[PDB]
Amino acid sequence: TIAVTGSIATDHLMRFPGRFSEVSLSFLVDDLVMHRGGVAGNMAFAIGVLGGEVALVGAAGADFADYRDWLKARGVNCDHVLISETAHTARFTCTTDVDMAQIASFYPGAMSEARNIKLADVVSAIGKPELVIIGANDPEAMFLHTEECRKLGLAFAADPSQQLARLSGEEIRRLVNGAAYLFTNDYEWDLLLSKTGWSEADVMAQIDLRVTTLGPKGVDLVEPDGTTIHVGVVPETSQTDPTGVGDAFRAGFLTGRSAGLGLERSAQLGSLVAVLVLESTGTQEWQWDYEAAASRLAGAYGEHAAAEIVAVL
Amino acid sequence: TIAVTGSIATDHLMRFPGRFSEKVSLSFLVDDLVMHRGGVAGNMAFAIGVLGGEVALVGAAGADFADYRDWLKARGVNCDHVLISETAHTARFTCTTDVDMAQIASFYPGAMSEARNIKLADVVSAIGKPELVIIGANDPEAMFLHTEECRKLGLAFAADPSQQLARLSGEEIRRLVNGAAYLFTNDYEWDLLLSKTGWSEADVMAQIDLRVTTLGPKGVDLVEPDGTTIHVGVVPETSQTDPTGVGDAFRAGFLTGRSAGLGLERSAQLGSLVAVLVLESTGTQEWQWDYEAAASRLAGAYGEHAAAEIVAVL
Numbered sequence A: 001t002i003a004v005t006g007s008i009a010t011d012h013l014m015r016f017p018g019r020f021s022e023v024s025l026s027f028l029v030d031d032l033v034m035h036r037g038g039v040a041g042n043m044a045f046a047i048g049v050l051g052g053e054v055a056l057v058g059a060a061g062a063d064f065a066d067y068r069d070w071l072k073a074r075g076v077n078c079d080h081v082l083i084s085e086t087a088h089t090a091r092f093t094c095t096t097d098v099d100m101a102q103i104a105s106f107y108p109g110a111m112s113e114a115r116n117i118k119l120a121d122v123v124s125a126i127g128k129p130e131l132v133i134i135g136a137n138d139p140e141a142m143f144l145h146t147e148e149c150r151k152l153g154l155a156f157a158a159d160p161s162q163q164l165a166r167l168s169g170e171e172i173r174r175l176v177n178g179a180a181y182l183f184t185n186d187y188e189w190d191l192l193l194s195k196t197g198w199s200e201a202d203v204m205a206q207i208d209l210r211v212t213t214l215g216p217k218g219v220d221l222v223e224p225d226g227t228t229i230h231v232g233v234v235p236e237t238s239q240t241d242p243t244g245v246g247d248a249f250r251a252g253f254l255t256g257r258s259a260g261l262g263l264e265r266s267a268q269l270g271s272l273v274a275v276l277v278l279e280s281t282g283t284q285e286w287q288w289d290y291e292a293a294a295s296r297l298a299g300a301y302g303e304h305a306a307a308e309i310v311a312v313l
Numbered sequence B: 001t002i003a004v005t006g007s008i009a010t011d012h013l014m015r016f017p018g019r020f021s022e023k024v025s026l027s028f029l030v031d032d033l034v035m036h037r038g039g040v041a042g043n044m045a046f047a048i049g050v051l052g053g054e055v056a057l058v059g060a061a062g063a064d065f066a067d068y069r070d071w072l073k074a075r076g077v078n079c080d081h082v083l084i085s086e087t088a089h090t091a092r093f094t095c096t097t098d099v100d101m102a103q104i105a106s107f108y109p110g111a112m113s114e115a116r117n118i119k120l121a122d123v124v125s126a127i128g129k130p131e132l133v134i135i136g137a138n139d140p141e142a143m144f145l146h147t148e149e150c151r152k153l154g155l156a157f158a159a160d161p162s163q164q165l166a167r168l169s170g171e172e173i174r175r176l177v178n179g180a181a182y183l184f185t186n187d188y189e190w191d192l193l194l195s196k197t198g199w200s201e202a203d204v205m206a207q208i209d210l211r212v213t214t215l216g217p218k219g220v221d222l223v224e225p226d227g228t229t230i231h232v233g234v235v236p237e238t239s240q241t242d243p244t245g246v247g248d249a250f251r252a253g254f255l256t257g258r259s260a261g262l263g264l265e266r267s268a269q270l271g272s273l274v275a276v277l278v279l280e281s282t283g284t285q286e287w288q289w290d291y292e293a294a295a296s297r298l299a300g301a302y303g304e305h306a307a308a309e310i311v312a313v314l
């Protein structure tokens, strides 16, 4: 059972049929759609679709009913979503240009109440989770979640992503120590190092595994002893929107890990889910086709890897 | 009766408590998010109706327009000639405003694209000939067809291209300007119009009856073809909050004053008042008309005599 903590949101996604090369910026967009989102919602949805046991742990508004149904239909346990008395579910508004560059605004709303969520209640309700993802969230919620994981003996994955630029060096440091996984992208890895003052070795001495996504260059899985697995991307055919691609990779990778797959196979599955999200507009708008999944995995990584991956799904 | 053509929209307005000083990947943590009635035509029609003017809104919206229609009709706006799309939703304007009143925004036209199917002939046959038709930012082809139909039926019009000036070609802008009773732009838009059309200042003034050029905090200029220039300073602000719709508000106040028989200067003073009232509220139609506060601020900025003459016709 994987407990996913992080933002729950509605994503208002727009497409600008140009390049962000323009203060009074005005972008004439040719698409506007509203989808389910938030990093925790995305990851929980992806884990549920892939057949994993997952519980969403975040803060939303009373408007969450439909979202809840949508997630429960995919096996996600939403019993422990905090419902705000007053605030609306967070909203992410984003414009993506032809180069997949993005200009976005995030209104937290009910997200600010995630700091009132208590993992002790979740553990008493569902047992101790096999892993807790500490994703982008209310900052205080992120810190309290990590500290409660440490105190209750729960393995956790530090996944600060969008919040890394808004946290101080000390805050980021408090999020990293003891993590079973550390997820960032390459730019975020450099930023984490610069802000915390830690060296690469300093970080690796405190975590069990570093996972660094590299956009089109794939992903690196680095162990504390330097052992590095590089997994290339599942090449894309219909690139459309980058929102939620990292969440998708994390969900696929952690589902594979929970299914007993090795690091490389789990990262290959994560790459598949990531490209499926890249090729759709919303973050949870992708479909799971077992045969197309097997085919694309085999094309990218070989028949043996594809077969071993699809066997556990 | 003033016919207002232009965009009808829902404005999703956010506040960034910082300054826009940030493979682009901009992310702004905002601390306010509100949804309001908008579109340049909706804003101007609302303002004219609130001020007691006779006004008809002429634009394209979606079936979701019912509540907006009720809201506008409660203020005396005639919405009979709003085109309701079978398919599209009302346009949406999404904007983030920083502490310096700088803005980063995206506009989804949606139903606005169908304004090019509106025919001002139907409006005139229904309500008579409007005293003036505002050609505001809209579906570009709709703007051109509206201007040409004004010329064809002999209706006075105000060229008010604003947000669309940067997206139109020189020839397109030129075809929008000729014969206009009014030309509304801001100073940056005036420079851009000259550069894009290749016209000189004199070239423009020879084709219009009046140039109105807003200057942000520096006020507004009203320039006649013979060079006669009236400069009206702003009504100084007390609670600057959001710049969305301020120009629309000025245009509405000014044209209401003009339709009420006020001179150019008095009309521009009223417009400045409405503009600052919009500047001091978040939405574009979220302001209230307080007769006493209006009189007081007009008098403080322009004198008791001007304030009295302005409030007398309202």
Ligand SMILES: CSc1ncnc2c1ncn2[C@@H]1O[C@H](CO)[C@@H](O)[C@H]1O
Pocket: A007, A008, A009, A010, A011, A036, A037, A038, A039, A042, A091, A092, A106, A136, A137, A162, A163, A243, A244, A245, A246, A247, A283, B027, B029
């Ligand atoms: C303080 S900024 C922030 N914080 C938390 N979550 C964010 C933020 N910005 C976007 N999202 C959510 O991330 C998802 C894509 O990973 C998108 O679905 C989007 O909702």
Ligand SMILES: CSc1ncnc2c1ncn2[C@@H]1O[C@H](CO)[C@@H](O)[C@H]1O
Pocket: A026, A028, B007, B008, B009, B010, B011, B037, B038, B039, B040, B043, B092, B093, B107, B137, B138, B163, B164, B244, B245, B246, B247, B248, B284
């Ligand atoms: C092609 S860009 C565009 N076109 C037409 N109208 C626009 C546009 N952008 C914003 N608006 C509307 O203008 C109002 C503020 O004057 C705001 O209320 C907003 O709705």
Ligand code: NA
Pocket: A240, A241, A242, A243, A244, A245, A277, A278, A279, A280, A281, A282, A283
């Ligand atoms: Na996407």
Ligand code: NA
Pocket: B241, B242, B243, B244, B245, B246, B278, B279, B280, B281, B282, B283, B284
């Ligand atoms: Na405003």
